[PDB]
Symmetry: D2
Subunit: 32 residues, 4 copies
């Protein structure tokens, strides 16, 4: 049924979290 | 400060979500 | 800077995960 | 089967994200 569709939404959310992680690391690292 | 540490926790959470996604796909796919 | 904005995106993601949790529970519970 | 258990793990993850959101807001707000 919907389980595979739900899984793909979770993967998309995981990618958003990774992007936010990298955003935070960049805020920490500044101009270097 | 703590931003890089927070980022790593978010990456760990992202990996948990990916694992759950694959778990759900496996429930859907059964014995094949 | 952007930290409060990032926080609100994380809260929005948390709400998406809660919605998915309830969706999965509903798939499990069927017509009752 | 496992769907309700998976849902509870997703809810726990959502709560971790909310905690991180509030942590980031606190970093932004400082001593006030």
């Amino acid at each position: 049924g919907k389980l595979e569709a739900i899984a793909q939404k979770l993967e998309a959310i995981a990618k958003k979290l990774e992007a936010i992680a990298w955003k935070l690391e960049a805020i920490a690292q500044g101009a270097g």
